[PDB]
């Protein structure tokens, strides 16, 4: 186990110093946006370490 510890994998732009991006807003496809659905395109930004 120990899947509690997450880390952000994809973001639209690099962080400012001491930034805290708590939002799990879905990443941008490059194509037309995905207004709240995962899949092919607009993937989920977080990722569990394991």
């Amino acid at each position, epitope marked *: *186990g120990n*899947y509690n510890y997450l880390y952000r*994998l994809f973001r639209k732009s690099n962080l400012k110093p001491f930034e805290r991006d708590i939002s*799990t807003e879905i990443y941008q496809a490059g194509s037309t946006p995905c207004n709240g*659905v*995962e*899949g*092919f395109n607009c*993937y*989920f930004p*977080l*990722q*569990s*370490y*394991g």
Partner: antibody, heavy 122, light 108 residues
Framework: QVQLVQSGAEVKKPGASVKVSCKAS????????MHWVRQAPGQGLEWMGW????????NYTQMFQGRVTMTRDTSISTAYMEVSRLRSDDTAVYYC???????????????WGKGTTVTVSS | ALTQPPSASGSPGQSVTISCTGT?????????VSWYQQHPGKAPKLMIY???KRPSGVPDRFSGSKSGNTASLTVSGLQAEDEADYYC??????????FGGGTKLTVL
């Protein structure tokens, strides 16, 4: 080991429900998306949907949205697929599959379970 | 669904091909088309993952590429190891994946 451990075969009364469980092993359970595909013994193969152990989001086809739900269980590194109404048209071997894609949801389905045979009788 | 020819024939050491006639929509411009090799009584494995790419452990005898609307993978120098049916797959828009009907590779 990337072998998926899949639950035993189950027989169900028609119209009722059934749940299928696949236990991941060896690989990292978190990011790797897990699809669910059915193969009727007649012919062909069809795709229902996927669950991801990272976020828990679902998606389905139109043929199964509102008729079948899926869920995860990160404690035992397993994901469950639930069917609400086991119709006689749904006698099939249900396969759980992993994608090559690491944390993205491309449909590159590589390693498959040994086959949980689902039988609907009357 | 994706239409597909039902069968193909050959002999060990020959070269044959298989295809599935999907539309220009949902196959041609909508990439990530993949094929799978399925023996009866056992789980299948991905055999071409991209439109033209082989996963690790794939033998060199297998090759495929989309061609306009249709897609096709051909096998040369076959043996008794390839007596299985072959299913193709495409994204087909908005998380609604579809498989083909499946063609059976036969060897004399």
């Amino acid at each position: 080991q990337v072998q998926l451990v899949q639950s035993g075969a189950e027989v169900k009364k028609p119209g009722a429900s059934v749940k299928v469980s696949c236990k991941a092993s060896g690989y990292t359970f978190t990011g790797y998306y897990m699809h669910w595909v059915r193969q009727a013994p007649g012919q062909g193969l069809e795709w229902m949907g996927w669950i991801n152990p990272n976020s828990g989001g679902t998606n389905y086809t139109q043929m199964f949205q509102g008729r079948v739900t899926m869920t995860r269980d990160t404690s035992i590194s397993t994901a469950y697929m639930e069917v609400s109404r086991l119709r006689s048209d749904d006698t099939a071997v249900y396969y759980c599959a992993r994608d090559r894609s690491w944390a993205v949801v491309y449909y590159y389905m590589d390693v498959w379970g040994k086959g949980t045979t689902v039988t609907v009788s009357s | 669904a994706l239409t597909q020819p039902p069968s193909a024939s050959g002999s060990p050491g020959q070269s044959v091909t298989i295809s599935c006639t999907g539309t220009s929509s949902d196959v041609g411009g909508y990439n990530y088309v993949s094929w799978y090799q399925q023996h009866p009584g056992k789980a299948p494995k991905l055999m071409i993952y991209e439109v033209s790419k082989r996963p690790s452990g794939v033998p060199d005898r297998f090759s495929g590429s989309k061609s306009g609307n249709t897609a096709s993978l051909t096998v040369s120098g076959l043996q008794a190891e390839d007596e299985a049916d072959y299913y193709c797959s495409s994204y087909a828009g908005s998380n609604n994946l579809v498989f083909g009907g499946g063609t059976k590779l036969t060897v004399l």
